[PDB]
């Protein structure tokens, strides 16, 4: 129900923000890719983490409603044709296959220009600073995974490593570290503990995908699923020693049911 | 010469900032595109009337890069299969053609992050919206381009008119504001004036390209050229009167060197 609650109030807002003003399939489009589905674990993760620390609701759900319009973005301009080419997204046609590629392609680009309006909002200098920065590690992430299927070129373990912890590990690093600025604690060791984390779920992620199943460089096919695996629980396990030692007992639960729904694929 | 040290300074700043990190395409082409040529007047503009404001240096450079590499990340997407499809950008093969589309989608979205990144060390909430708010009103501009080429649809003068506003004017609107800003003035004039050198900017273009030939809807076809012209000369003249008025005289000069140009063609 807490966790519901939670994400009703990011839906409503998502829709406020995305409520077409101008006639154009640009907003129906960036409307339909943020509503066709999500288990919005970033938001719920922010509101989570500022709720144990007992941060302004407000300011909160700037920062949550902006790093889930980023996600968005970020999985539209993935889902293109030039890059990943998906028919499909949350089980719905992309947004390309709906709207055409150039309007899928605008919808993108507006979707991150609102989640740095949003983030604007809040007028935390250091919070837009380190969304900025987030912002391009994901880019460059992106990028190193492009790059790495598609040249020919020596990609060692490190590098894989280091391609997960920007294209994935960024923005759960920058969810870990926001509310904390926002209550004026040093950010800097749970920054750390939310690329961890979202290394692990990229790594859960790759396996859920074989299952599924049932080129890319990615982490299994470097390390093999045993050791793929024993590095996210490890991260995972240091993160949850991490987010209890800080006395964050709604999240700690929040990334136990997480963990438990991972375990029982 | 003076022109000249203000835009070498930009060249330097632009070449460190894209100075690649990681061994990526995408940062080579990022520096490619930003490189290849360029008159740089939007930063050349917001370098001028911060200079006639007498502004601190570094956060005007900072400002004046921010808006090059916004405009760069722009030029990258509008040229893109999808939307444009141009083959040629500044005389030189597009970002697109030298590097793939899926290389030169990044390159984009890259520049807007560093761009962002940019305006967020100047440290001022009041410069990250208005920022924020004009990266999404040239958004929109774009997508009203697009869309009102591309669907069969009602369009008015008046939609060609905020068309262009949005997706011209909104950028120079910025280069004109954020001196003041910076000089905590009250920008709000000079925010108007600047969206309409912006409009009058974009409908010198629409003439040029006529000239230069020697589905889109232009205000020169809405309206005709004599129309246009004079709209864009009325215009020119408000912001010329709107600048000397402000004792803005390196920017008045600034702005007489262009309109020069312009007629010579």
Known sequence: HHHHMKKEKVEERIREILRPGWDLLTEEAMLYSATVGGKRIRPLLVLTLGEDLGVE?????DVAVAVELFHTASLIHDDLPPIDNADFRRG??????????DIALLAGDGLFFLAFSQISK????????EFSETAYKLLLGEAMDVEFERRKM???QEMVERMYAFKTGALFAFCFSAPFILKGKDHTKMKLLGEKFGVAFQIYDDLKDILGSF???TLVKKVGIQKAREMADKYYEEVLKGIESEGLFRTLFLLKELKQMVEER
């Open 57 to 61: 609701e407000e300011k909160l759900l």
């Open 92 to 101: 719905k046609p992309s947004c390309h296959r709906t709207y055409g590629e």
């Open 122 to 129: 809040i007028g935390n200098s250091k919070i837009f600073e």
């Open 154 to 156: 020596e990609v060692s």
């Open 215 to 217: 080129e890319k460089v």
